[PDB]
Amino acid sequence: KPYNKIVSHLLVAEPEKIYAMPDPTVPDSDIKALTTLCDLADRELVVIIGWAKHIPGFSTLSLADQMSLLQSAWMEILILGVVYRSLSFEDELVYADDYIMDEDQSKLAGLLDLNNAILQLVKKYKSMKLEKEEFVTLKAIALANSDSMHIEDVEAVQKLQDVLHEALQDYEAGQHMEDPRRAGKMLMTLPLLRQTSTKAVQHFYNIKLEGKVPMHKLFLEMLEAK
Amino acid sequence: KPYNKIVSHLLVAEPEKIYAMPDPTVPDSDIKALTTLCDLADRELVVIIGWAKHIPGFSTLSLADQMSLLQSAWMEILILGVVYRSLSFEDELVYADDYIMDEDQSKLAGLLDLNNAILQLVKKYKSMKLEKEEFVTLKAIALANSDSMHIEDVEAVQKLQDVLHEALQDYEAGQHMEDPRRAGKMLMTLPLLRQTSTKAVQHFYNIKLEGKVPMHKLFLEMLEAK
Numbered sequence A, B: 001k002p003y004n005k006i007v008s009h010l011l012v013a014e015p016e017k018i019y020a021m022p023d024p025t026v027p028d029s030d031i032k033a034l035t036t037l038c039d040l041a042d043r044e045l046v047v048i049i050g051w052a053k054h055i056p057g058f059s060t061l062s063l064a065d066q067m068s069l070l071q072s073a074w075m076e077i078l079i080l081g082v083v084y085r086s087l088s089f090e091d092e093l094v095y096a097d098d099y100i101m102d103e104d105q106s107k108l109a110g111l112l113d114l115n116n117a118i119l120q121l122v123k124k125y126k127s128m129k130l131e132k133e134e135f136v137t138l139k140a141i142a143l144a145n146s147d148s149m150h151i152e153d154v155e156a157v158q159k160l161q162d163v164l165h166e167a168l169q170d171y172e173a174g175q176h177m178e179d180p181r182r183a184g185k186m187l188m189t190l191p192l193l194r195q196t197s198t199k200a201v202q203h204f205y206n207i208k209l210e211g212k213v214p215m216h217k218l219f220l221e222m223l224e225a226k
């Protein structure tokens, strides 16, 4: 009756934060900002692949299904990270401790509209007082619930969805008795995450095609997987 | 302890079906198919505005907030309708009783990819054995949970979300004791609905800009509202 083991487990499995390391020799530009961001994403993708797979049941899926889930969910997982890191800030996005974007910098990078949607996600979670326990559980649910069209073992993926959903249910029933509908409210934040991810993928795909911003192999593989 | 009044109420508030009435004098073409579809959407938008509103609390919102919710959610509500009408079919979308699209017709209309996503929604709901009670409750939740950036009374909209969520919870606790997580599973279908809506809006906005397909005023107002 002290809280849910899956939640406890996801908390200890949480990766250490990564630095963006913008090149201090390079003049600030939209190209610099986008290059720095895509480089950070590439490195975070490695972390995410390693992180997944720790999710109970995930490593028992075929490598194909593991890949399918990751290829569908990666943008949502990246976005939920920057949202969480940004909860204590106002109108700023904490991509990394050394890379915090305000409205002006978003404009300069051509990301004002996209970043404003991310800020909408932040605003909603601030109102809800999203906890770390809830954040890690939602990242794992976003992975399991990512709607890949290419899944081999649909029943096994549904089972993963269920284990993680039950964990959220249990956590909320124990920790948040004042709100018998909090788990559901948390699940109801997922559509805006999906919407913002969908738009972010299209945006960076367009940037990929325009050919002006260098991108690493893994990030390109993940982008091209949609 | 017989089922939830909000669910009962949404069932009786369900609009009658509408016909597409493709013009039988016009040769089949992508233009004919898209014109017929946008015309059907325009007429369904009127129905949806009338339907909303019957949702408890909805008419008590400012006209601004009523409009904001409708302008954000309309595509999701239209899509959930064609999904529901299509549950008893295989690889076909029942836009209307007189307008059922198979894979070949989708290709001809340039909607193969979009319609395939809608078919993914259908497939998931078929597996879950979505009921009419659950369909109408999800349409109302999609309206309340539509993430407009323009809401005046955020607390009032959150209250609407909560009333409808509680209705789903209650319905599932009474009707589906075999699955204590069914309400949550239903909420977890909303991200794919949002994703498919997001893509459909962009697609028809592109068609709007290309200027080849005639569109009526209300449909244009709703499209331009995103």
Ligand SMILES: Oc1ccc(C2(c3ccc(O)cc3)CCCCC2)cc1
Pocket (backbone or CB within 6 Å): A037, A038, A040, A041, A044, A078, A079, A081, A082, A095, A111, A114, A115, A118, A200, A204
């Ligand atoms: O932790 C993150 C989150 C998002 C990101 C990206 C991002 C996504 C959306 C956005 O509005 C800004 C940056 C960088 C650019 C490539 C896609 C992912 C990078 C690291």
Ligand SMILES: Oc1ccc(C2(c3ccc(O)cc3)CCCCC2)cc1
Pocket (backbone or CB within 6 Å): B037, B038, B040, B041, B044, B078, B079, B081, B082, B095, B111, B114, B115, B118, B200, B204
């Ligand atoms: O009941 C509906 C549902 C969707 C539709 C549209 C639709 C949406 C998505 C899609 O893949 C096909 C048609 C018609 C074209 C204008 C947008 C809405 C019309 C009536």
